[PDB]
Nucleic acid binder design. Structure first.
Lengths: 46, 48
RNA sequence: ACACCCAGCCGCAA
């Protein structure tokens, strides 16, 4: 463990097992929506 | 009823009002054996 | 070879 590691500069994207998506009998999990907002704001700032 | 002998004590008898309740024996029974499985938890799901 | 997604709320059981 390092202080450089302790502060975050790359955000791990969990797989779809962590954030499942199901079609009604395609709704996205809310964590997927939030991390999509993360990458959207990252692209905007880029 | 079985023997036909008189019951030694004297039983208290008479009509009275009973009610049948919503909670059924058939609606409450439940058995599970490796059936449907939850998509997220990969575990048994939430009830009968 | 099965089919039904989840959150929330409420009522209710011992």
């Amino acid at each position: 463990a390092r202080p450089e590691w302790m502060i975050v500069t790359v955000l791990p994207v969990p797989p779809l097992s962590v954030r499942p998506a199901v079609v009604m009998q395609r709704n996205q999990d809310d964590l997927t929506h939030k991390l999509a907002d993360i990458v959207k704001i990252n692209n905007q700032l880029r | 009823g079985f023997t036909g002998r008189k019951i030694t004590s004297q039983i208290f008898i008479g009509p009275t009002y009973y009610q049948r309740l919503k909670h059924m024996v058939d609606d409450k029974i439940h058995s599970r054996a490796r059936g449907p499985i939850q998509i997220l938890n990969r575990q048994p799901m939430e009830g009968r």
